[PDB]
């Protein structure tokens, strides 16, 4: 399927809630990777998923300091699931136009 369609299939709320808990100071982290596992391919279409996690939470990001902290968590999320981090995630541009 197209990258936009694969992301729409899975429920990214555990991923968004896991990142937001760390930013703002049952197992969301396991469920996030469990929901990210229900994809045709993780090495690919992962950047669109990572961007969509930030897109669904932009209204709760107040300034660029919060956005920068959110980006750091997103780029570390693949390592949290024992995945491979993609090498072309353009989160900076997408985080400034949401």
């Amino acid at each position, epitope marked *: 399927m197209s990258c936009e369609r694969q992301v729409d299939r899975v429920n990214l709320k555990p991923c968004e809630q896991h990142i937001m808990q760390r930013i703002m100071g049952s197992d969301q982290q396991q469920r996030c990777c469990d929901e990210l596992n229900e994809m045709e391919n993780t090495q690919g279409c992962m950047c669109e998923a990572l961007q969509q996690i930030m897109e669904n939470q932009c209204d709760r990001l*107040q*300034d660029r300091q*919060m956005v*920068q902290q959110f980006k750091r968590e997103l780029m570390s999320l693949p390592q949290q699931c024992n995945f491979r981090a993609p090498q072309r995630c353009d989160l900076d541009v997408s985080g400034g136009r*949401c």
Partner: antibody
Amino acid sequence: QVQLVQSGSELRKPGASVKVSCKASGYTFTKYGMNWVRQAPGQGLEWMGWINTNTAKPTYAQDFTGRFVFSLDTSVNTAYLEISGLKAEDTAVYYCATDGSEGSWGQGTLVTVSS
Amino acid sequence: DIQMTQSPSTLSASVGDRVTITCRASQSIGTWLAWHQQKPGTAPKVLIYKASNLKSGVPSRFSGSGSGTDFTLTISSLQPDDVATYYCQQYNTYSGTFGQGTRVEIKR
């Protein structure tokens, strides 16, 4: 009640330095970064850059590189703006500001540079 | 580099008139825009954040809308104490620059 209280007016001679303080209260200081805005007399607002209140890393717009340095003291919830090599054209009102739902403006600090 | 073009540089209107100030960005900034009000001699006050959210204490006749590149600030019924200069401001990751400003005066 979010409040940004800045230091008072300053008069400086050319080539000297000034240090403007901005004390924050009513919110978590490290939650949001601090912006700095300059307003020359009768002109608009120029964004100077911002400082990450969590990591202390400053970011400057090009026109305010070199002689302008952002710093902070988290234990007191204060951000600092220090200008060196003052010129007459540096005479302006300097504001600290935050963005977002809790964003606010400091009352501003008038820095006058004159012989 | 993102350019902030505030359309009315100056504006004259009557009391009770609808007043619209437009900010247009050279490229999308996506809701990362704020509206400020400054009266001479006094510090600016934030009117709108996230391009549509009213700040506390702002009269309800003030209104913001738009996303992407096009944003407008609207005063539903202009009052004599609305005489000020209005600034849009992007606050995305890259930049925090302001618009050139809109001076509002009352026609009487």
